[PDB]
Amino acid sequence: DALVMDRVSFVKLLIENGVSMHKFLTIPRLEELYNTKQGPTNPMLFHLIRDVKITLIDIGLVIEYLMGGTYRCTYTRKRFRLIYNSETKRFPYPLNELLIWACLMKRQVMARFLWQHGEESMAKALVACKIYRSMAYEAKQSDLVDDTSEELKQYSNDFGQLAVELLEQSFRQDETMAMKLLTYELKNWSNSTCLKLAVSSRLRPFVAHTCTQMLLSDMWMGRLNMRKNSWYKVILSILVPPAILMLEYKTKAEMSHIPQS
Amino acid sequence: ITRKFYAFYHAPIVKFWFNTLAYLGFLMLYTFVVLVKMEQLPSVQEWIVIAYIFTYAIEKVREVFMKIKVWFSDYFNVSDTIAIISFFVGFGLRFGAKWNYINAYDNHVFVAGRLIYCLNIIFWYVRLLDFLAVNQQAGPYVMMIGKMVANMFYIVVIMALVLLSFGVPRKAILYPHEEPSWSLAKDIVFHPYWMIFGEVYAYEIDVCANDSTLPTICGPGTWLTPFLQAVYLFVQYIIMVNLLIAFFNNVYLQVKAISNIVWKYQRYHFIMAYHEKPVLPPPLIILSHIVSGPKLFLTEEDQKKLHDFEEQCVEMY
Amino acid sequence: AGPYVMMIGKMVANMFYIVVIMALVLLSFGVPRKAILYPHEEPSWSLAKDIVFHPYWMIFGEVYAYEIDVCANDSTLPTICGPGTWLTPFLQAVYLFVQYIIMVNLLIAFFNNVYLQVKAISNIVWKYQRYHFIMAYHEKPVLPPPL
Numbered sequence: 053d054a055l056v057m058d059r060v061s062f063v064k065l066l067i068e069n070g071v072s073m074h075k076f077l078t079i080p081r082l083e084e085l086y087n088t089k090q091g092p093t094n095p096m097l098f099h100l101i102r103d104v105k106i107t108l109i110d111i112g113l114v115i116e117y118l119m120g121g122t123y124r125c126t127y128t129r130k131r132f133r134l135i136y137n138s139e140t141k142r143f144p145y146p147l148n149e150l151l152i153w154a155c156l157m158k159r160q161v162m163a164r165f166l167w168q169h170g171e172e173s174m175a176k177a178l179v180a181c182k183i184y185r186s187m188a189y190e191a192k193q194s195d196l197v198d199d200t201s202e203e204l205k206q207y208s209n210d211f212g213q214l215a216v217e218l219l220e221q222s223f224r225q226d227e228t229m230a231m232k233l234l235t236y237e238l239k240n241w242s243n244s245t246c247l248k249l250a251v252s253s254r255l256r257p258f259v260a261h262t263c264t265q266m267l268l269s270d271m272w273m274g275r276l277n278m279r280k281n282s283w284y285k286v287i288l289s290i291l292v293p294p295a296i297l298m299l300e301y302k303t304k305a306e307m308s309h310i311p312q313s
Numbered sequence: 314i315t316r317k318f319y320a321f322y323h324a325p326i327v328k329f330w331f332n333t334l335a336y337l338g339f340l341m342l343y344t345f346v347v348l349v350k351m352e353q354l355p356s357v358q359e360w361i362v363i364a365y366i367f368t369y370a371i372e373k374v375r376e377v378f379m380k381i382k383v384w385f386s387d388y389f390n391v392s393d394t395i396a397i398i399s400f401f402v403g404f405g406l407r408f409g410a411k412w413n414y415i416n417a418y419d420n421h422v423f424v425a426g427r428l429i430y431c432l433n434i435i436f437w438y439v440r441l442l443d444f445l446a447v448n449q450q451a452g453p454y455v456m457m458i459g460k461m462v463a464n465m466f467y468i469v470v471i472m473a474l475v476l477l478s479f480g481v482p483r484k485a486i487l488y489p490h491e492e493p494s495w496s497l498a499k500d501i502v503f504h505p506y507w508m509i510f511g512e513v514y515a516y517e518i519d520v521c522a523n524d525s526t527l528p529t530i531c532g533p534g535t536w537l538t539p540f541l542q543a544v545y546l547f548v549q550y551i552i553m554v555n556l557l558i559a560f561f562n563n564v565y566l567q568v569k570a571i572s573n574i575v576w577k578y579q580r581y582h583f584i585m586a587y588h589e590k591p592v593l594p595p596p597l598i599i600l601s602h603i604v605s606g607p608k609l610f611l612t613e614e615d616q617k618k619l620h621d622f623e624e625q626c627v628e629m630y
Numbered sequence: 631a632g633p634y635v636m637m638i639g640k641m642v643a644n645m646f647y648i649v650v651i652m653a654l655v656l657l658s659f660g661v662p663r664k665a666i667l668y669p670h671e672e673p674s675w676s677l678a679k680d681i682v683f684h685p686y687w688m689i690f691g692e693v694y695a696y697e698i699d700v701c702a703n704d705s706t707l708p709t710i711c712g713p714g715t716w717l718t719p720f721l722q723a724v725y726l727f728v729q730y731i732i733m734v735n736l737l738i739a740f741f742n743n744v745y746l747q748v749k750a751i752s753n754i755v756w757k758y759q760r761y762h763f764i765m766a767y768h769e770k771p772v773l774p775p776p777l
């Protein structure tokens with residue numbers, strides 16, 4: 053009831069005492085909690101379901117629509133369509149499901165509460181930024197009264213600032229590890245790199261941070277080692293192929309954070 | 314040792330510099346082609362040019378097919394379609410043409426082929442700014458020029474109204490006996506346009522006076538044009554081109570801060586193209602299309618050592 | 631006058647990539663202007679001189695007013711009236727617009743907004759090199775090098 057009625061500070065108390073989100077969320081707890089009009093709802097969510105009462109497969113068609121490209125949401129895969137259509141009806145990561153729920157239903161304080169305690173939080177900030185931003189773009193076009201694109205933008209810019217602040221946090225503690233956070237496969241969010249997930253939404257303060265502009269400067273070098281290598285020795289070694297063999301390079305301890313082919 | 318060739322050639326620096334060295338070879342050959350006398354049969358240099366633009370177009374089709382309206386968003390891809398399409402319109406009229414052979418090599422089809430062949434180098438020199446825009450310092454200026462051309466447009470419109478409102482009564486006073494021709498447009502825009510840029514046409518002012526060129530134009534009324542040119546040069550050169558310096562001057566810092574971030578963002582899409590380009594430049598790409606992700610690899614140990622680094626950074630946040 | 635001499639080099643080293651863009655605009659007008667106007671050429675090193683030469687002085691005031699509209703009356707160079715030479719007033723119009731209204735006017739904005747930080751840096755670089763200047767004159771003998 054506290055989730056449907058948007059009581060954030062009762063979700064705080066009520067999981068702080070004794071309720072695990074594991075074994076709370078079953079599949080009919082999402083169908084319910086998604087198709088209830090007993091709280092503040094998102095009126096344009098049904099406009100996105102018009103691409104097709106509400107089933108989770110019709111939800112992940114919305115999520116695959118909002119996060120474009122080859123984004124495969126977990127609900128539309130074969131294993132979920134076999135557990136669906138009738139212990140196994142729980143979710144392995146429940147707060148990844150309620151972060152998407154609280155972003156689609158346009159309830160922000162619930163979303164910034166469900167964000168801040170789960171695993172892989174900087175990826176949830178960017179997923180939430182992309183979902184909000186593309187709902188804003190799919191609300192500027194087709195609405196007349198309280199279009200709320202002015203409201204959904206500044207909800208994507210409140211998560212897209214969290215992502216930046218977390219990456220500025222993790223950059224200052226270790227740099228070779230923070231550059232690993234940018235490109236590791238997420239495996240919950242459709243095997244998307246965190247940095248690609250922040251380029252799909254055009255999140256310029258993330259891609260222009262010194263963590264991503266340092267990783268791009270380490271992908272530009274490739275295997276070579278331009279910290280000590282001559283700049284002109286690249287052009288010389290292009291023109292003179294026996295000058296390739298003796299310039300400089302990098303070892304696998306230095307190529308660890310660089311995503312190789 | 315043979316992993317040092319595979320390691321060297323697949324770096325994006327080496328794909329980049331290998332591509333721009335062959336691009337500067339393309340421009341040097343293409344302006345030797347263009348500047349020197351064209352003949353009926355193409356020279357050695359010209360087939361290298363057509364080989365570059367043909368196989369370059371093949372690589373652009375491969376880069377579009379591996380979504381079209383995404384590719385038209387960059388301003389150096391709209392210029393690539395116009396460069397490649399108008400090159401072969403120029404090469405169609407150059408090569409597939411009637412000779413009408415003489416000591417005079419000018420036939421009406423060959424000449425237009427050579428002029429669509431001369432005006433086309435401009436697109437490739439503009440394409441050099443896509444290369445000059447990849448380093449830390451010259452990137453924001455190239456990303457800044459377009460962001461300020463798109464921003465001064467309504468000072469340039471006011472300068473064009475001042476340009477017309479001097480161009481029309483200056484001809485109309487000086488040249489009363491005209492017949493309708495399209496040289497009226499050329500001469501009302503033409504002569505007051507170069508007065509912004511230094512040429513005051515000093516002897517053409519005071520057309521009635523001695524020490525003057527154009528002495529045949531001494532009709533009644535021509536004593537007005539030094540006053541019209543005086544007010545025109547005052548307004549244009551002292552108000553308009555001096556409100557444009559103030560405009561760039563006060564817009565510069567916000568457009569540098571914006572354009573620096575737009576460069577830092579588009580550096581991602583620039584580097585991820587060079588993880589996909591084959592290791593040959595487009596004249597040497599006759600091999601790597603007859604022949605034919607970037608994921609990060611962590612062990613099970615370091616995925617856990619990374620996974621409790623992220624939790625520590627969030628809790629410290 | 632110390633900081634200005636220490637400042638000129640610190641801003642020549644700093645405007646280099648606006649001058650490179652001005653040199654690309656300079657070439658991309660210099661080559662089709664010759665190529666349109668002079669179709670019958672043989673390979674010589676006077677091609678380089680004449681593609682850089684005439685569009686270089688247009689930044690500095692000389693518009694070459696009579697050489698524009700080579701077909702027209704009241705014109706020097708009246709022998710160059712081949713087909714296609716009606717294009718060069720449009721190329722010179724776009725070249726002078728871009729060069730003189732965008733590039734040399736983005737250079738005034740560049741010096742204008744860089745001036746105060748380069749004056750603050752260059753003043754300190756002068757005050758530091760004044761030490762190495764005075765300690766040379768505690769070592770020079772008392773005679774001008776002819777004496």
Ligand SMILES: CC(C)CCC[C@@H](C)[C@H]1CC[C@H]2[C@@H]3CC=C4C[C@@H](OC(=O)CCC(=O)O)CC[C@]4(C)[C@H]3CC[C@]12C
Nearest residue numbers: 326333441444445446447448449650653654656657682
């Ligand atoms: C991106 C990082 C790894 C640094 C490498 C960037 C290069 C791709 C840029 C920086 C310098 C640029 C060069 C700077 C100067 C020139 C000269 C330019 O022609 C002129 O300046 C002629 C001047 C004249 O003749 O008046 C042709 C492009 C070129 C080679 C540019 C090609 C692209 C370059 C090499």
Ligand SMILES: CC(C)CCC[C@@H](C)[C@H]1CC[C@H]2[C@@H]3CC=C4C[C@@H](OC(=O)CCC(=O)O)CC[C@]4(C)[C@H]3CC[C@]12C
Nearest residue numbers: 388439442455456458459460655658659721724725728
């Ligand atoms: C003989 C004459 C015609 C030669 C004149 C050359 C111009 C036609 C070239 C010189 C500089 C070029 C510009 C250089 C940089 C850009 C930036 C480019 O935009 C960007 O890359 C990002 C800016 C944005 O996102 O708006 C748009 C094209 C533009 C204006 C180019 C348009 C064509 C320009 C004006």
Ligand SMILES: CC(C)CCC[C@@H](C)[C@H]1CC[C@H]2[C@@H]3CC=C4C[C@@H](OC(=O)CCC(=O)O)CC[C@]4(C)[C@H]3CC[C@]12C
Nearest residue numbers: 473474477478481492493494495496497498499501502
């Ligand atoms: C829209 C604002 C900026 C003012 C209108 C623009 C006018 C200042 C000028 C610009 C060019 C002028 C035109 C310049 C050239 C001609 C061609 C000429 O008409 C013809 O050649 C038709 C006779 C023929 O072709 O035999 C004389 C008038 C006309 C249309 C002028 C009419 C007024 C125009 C459109």
Ligand SMILES: CC(C)CCC[C@@H](C)[C@H]1CC[C@H]2[C@@H]3CC=C4C[C@@H](OC(=O)CCC(=O)O)CC[C@]4(C)[C@H]3CC[C@]12C
Nearest residue numbers: 632634635636637638639640641642643752755756759
């Ligand atoms: C060729 C004929 C037409 C005369 C042209 C004069 C130039 C060749 C002279 C005039 C001013 C001179 C400059 C005057 C001052 C300096 C500052 C000097 O740097 C410093 O003294 C310290 C600056 C720093 O520390 O970076 C570097 C040389 C430079 C640019 C000089 C380079 C040569 C310049 C441009």
Ligand SMILES: CC(C)CCC[C@@H](C)[C@H]1CC[C@H]2[C@@H]3CC=C4C[C@@H](OC(=O)CCC(=O)O)CC[C@]4(C)[C@H]3CC[C@]12C
Nearest residue numbers: 337340341342344345657661673674675676677678679
């Ligand atoms: C690097 C970017 C900026 C573009 C490349 C610069 C090209 C625009 C221009 C600059 C000078 C031009 C050269 C100017 C002079 C000549 C001399 C001339 O060649 C010769 O003299 C050989 C004939 C002989 O010597 O008998 C004609 C082509 C060439 C190389 C031109 C080829 C194209 C060049 C290199």
